[PDB]
Write a protein that binds this ligand. Structure first.
Ligand SMILES: [Cl-]
Ligand SMILES: [Cl-]
Length: 162
């Protein structure tokens, strides 16, 4: 199991523009296009991301390309984030993947604000961080997915994804 498979499980794969859990225009494997309510705005963003007139649809390969880019960006985001970097560096390989998944889902900025959880994670206080992570809008809105990420931090194994 790895970060790619993990997120592929959590996000799914859709080849046609769609609205995410927040009602935002997305496509592929969790690739947010725009927060604008305009389907045209999204179609435009889409065409610009892919480099062609897509008409709201893309191929599996294009979806995968966006996904790789997105994963790469999340890692780079973490590495360049002063609050995130140190946490990441302190963790083992399974847990690093869980932090990447959180950043992928909610952005570098969103994660950087879980100050208390981040500190618990750095201190290797697993159960406590797990409890703290659950007191969030994130968990309340997408509980099944959040539980999977949280169990990953708690246990340091991929059991939740198996
Ligand atoms: Cl892009
Ligand atoms: Cl969910």
């Amino acid at each position: 199991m790895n970060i790619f498979e993990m997120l592929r499980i959590d996000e799914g794969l859709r080849l046609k523009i769609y609205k995410d859990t927040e009602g935002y225009y997305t496509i592929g494997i969790g690739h947010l296009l725009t927060k604008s309510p305009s389907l045209n705005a999204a179609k435009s963003e889409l065409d610009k991301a892919i480099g062609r007139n897509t008409n709201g649809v893309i191929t599996k390969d294009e979806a995968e390309k966006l996904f790789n880019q997105d994963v790469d960006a999340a890692v780079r985001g973490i590495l360049r984030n002063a609050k995130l970097k140190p946490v990441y560096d302190s963790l083992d390989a399974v847990r690093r993947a869980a932090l990447i998944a959180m950043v992928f889902q909610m952005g570098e900025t969103g994660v950087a604000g879980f100050t208390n959880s981040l500190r618990m994670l750095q201190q290797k206080r697993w159960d406590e961080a797990a409890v703290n992570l659950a007191k969030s809008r994130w968990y309340n809105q997408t509980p099944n997915r959040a539980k999977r990420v949280i169990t990953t931090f708690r246990t340091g194994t991929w059991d939740a994804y198996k």
